[PDB]
Design a protein around this ligand. Structure first.
Ligand SMILES: O=S1(=O)NC(Cc2cccc(C(F)(F)F)c2)=Nc2ccccc21
Length: 442
């Protein structure tokens, strides 16, 4: 029935040397690249979970150019009445379905590689056939829509809040001059847009830590860099305020921003404040935290407790709230890296190497959890000048990260030296330190 090895590479029988399954549509555990492509375009049934997971994770084991060459060759299949009807036509329609999902959900590969797109359009444009016309036409319209695209409140959003800095006075914008409510809202819109922009393939096979990270993971990198710039800027605001009374005002203002992040269910923001508060230069400031009111200390402790016991309280709090929210991104990076490190790239059976597909699938299920929260818009107005201020945060300046964190700790040792005495430092703020609070204006 199926073709011989001398004419087709996709029709060798299944064995423990080329394809292994998990414990109805079977679920592939590991297999050769040829075996994966074959099951990806299996003539017996439709497999949307495998199609979706394969196109998200394939870059970890196959190059885009190689995948196109293999699916084109899988399509080219050389009793002839039933051979075309039950084997050639179903496989060719499965190949076209794979091209459709590929161009629709992963167009960035055709954007990054112009020659890849040239080959894909050449392949689709040469198909012809009877039932393939409708397939060639939907695929063509998707490539058209993607090429063109590359080239709203449900209710009244609250009034934008201002404090010392008047609107448009961008040169005075700072932690204590902007309104703490507006800082949290504007940072939540910025973080919400960053969260929503991340694609699942940016998180596969640790590509964001490899040589071509800027191309493969630009949205993920933007998200981690925002977290680093915000957390380090909060710490810099704290240790660079040498006067103790003014430093209490600064730390206390950051706690107020975290409370507005909690009202907004921006967990990403909450844990960036907790991260700055737990950092080595800030966490050891006993004289500063002694002055922080009890209610405010309790708010910071309950925020920390979300992380405790492998984020037990965070995971329970996240699944109980209603939209909108901004989930804590770091836990996904943590669980994905644990998966990448604790599972082997390949499985060996009978001296043969099989790609570990279950490893990729476990990583793809974590990215699916990410995606379930990417359609939650906030009923908040953007303030372009405040958004720009946070987008342009550069606490590190022209320094390496380690050199700047070393400086932050040394500043902490300077402002709060035991048994060395506690020096008094002059005031740096020439405006009122009192917060306008976190209650909106009705
Ligand atoms: O006391 S916690 O539960 N809360 C925090 C967050 C936090 C950081 C800095 C100061 C404070 C404050 F309560 F004094 F304001 C709280 N970090 C911890 C780190 C390790 C163990 C226990 C905790």
């Amino acid at each position: 029935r199926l073709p011989s090895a001398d004419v087709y590479r996709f029709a060798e029988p299944d064995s423990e040397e080329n394809i292994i399954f998990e414990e109805g549509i079977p679920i592939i555990k590991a297999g050769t690249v040829i075996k994966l492509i074959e099951r990806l375009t299996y003539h017996m049934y439709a497999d949307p979970n495998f199609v979706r997971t394969f196109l998200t994770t394939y870059r970890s084991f196959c190059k885009p150019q190689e995948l196109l060459s293999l699916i084109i060759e899988r399509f080219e299949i050389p009793e002839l009445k039933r051979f075309r009807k039950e084997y050639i036509q179903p496989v060719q329609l499965r190949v076209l379905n794979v091209c459709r999902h590929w161009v629709e959900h992963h167009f960035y590969d055709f954007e990054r590689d112009a020659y890849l797109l040239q080959r894909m359009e050449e392949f689709i444009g040469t198909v012809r056939g009877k039932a393939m016309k409708k397939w060639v036409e939907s695929i063509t319209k998707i490539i058209q829509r993607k090429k063109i695209a590359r080239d709203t409140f449900q209710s009244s959003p609250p009034t934008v809040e201002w404090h010392i800095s008047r609107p448009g006075h961008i040169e005075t914008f700072d932690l204590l001059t902007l309104h703490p409510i507006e800082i949290a809202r504007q940072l939540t819109l910025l973080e919400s847009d960053l969260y929503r922009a991340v694609q699942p393939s940016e998180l596969v096979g640790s590509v964001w830590t490899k040589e071509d990270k800027e191309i493969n993971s630009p949205n993920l990198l933007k998200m981690i860099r925002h977290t680093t710039n915000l957390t380090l800027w909060f710490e810099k605001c704290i240790v660079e305020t040498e006067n103790l009374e003014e430093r209490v005002a600064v730390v206390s203002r950051i706690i107020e921003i975290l409370q507005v992040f909690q009202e907004l269910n921006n967990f990403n923001g909450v844990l960036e404040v907790v991260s700055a508060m737990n950092s080595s230069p800030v966490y050891r400031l006993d004289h500063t935290f002694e002055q922080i009111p009890s209610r405010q200390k309790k708010i910071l402790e309950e925020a920390h407790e979300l992380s405790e016991d492998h984020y037990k309280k965070y995971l329970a709090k996240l699944r109980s709230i209603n939209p909108p929210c901004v989930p804590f991104f770091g836990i996904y990076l943590t669980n994905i890296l644990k998966t990448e490190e604790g599972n082997p790239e390949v499985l060996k059976r009978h001296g043969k190497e099989l790609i570990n597909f279950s490893k990729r699938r476990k990583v793809a299920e974590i990215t699916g959890e990410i995606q379930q929260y990417q359609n939650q818009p906030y009923c908040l107005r953007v303030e372009s000048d405040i958004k720009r201020f946070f987008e342009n945060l550069n606490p590190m300046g022209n320094s390496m990260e380690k050199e700047f964190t070393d400086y932050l700790f040394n500043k902490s040792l300077e402002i709060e030296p035991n048994p060395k005495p506690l020096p008094r430092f002059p005031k740096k703020y020439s405006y009122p330190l009192k917060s306008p609070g976190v209650r909106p204006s009705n």
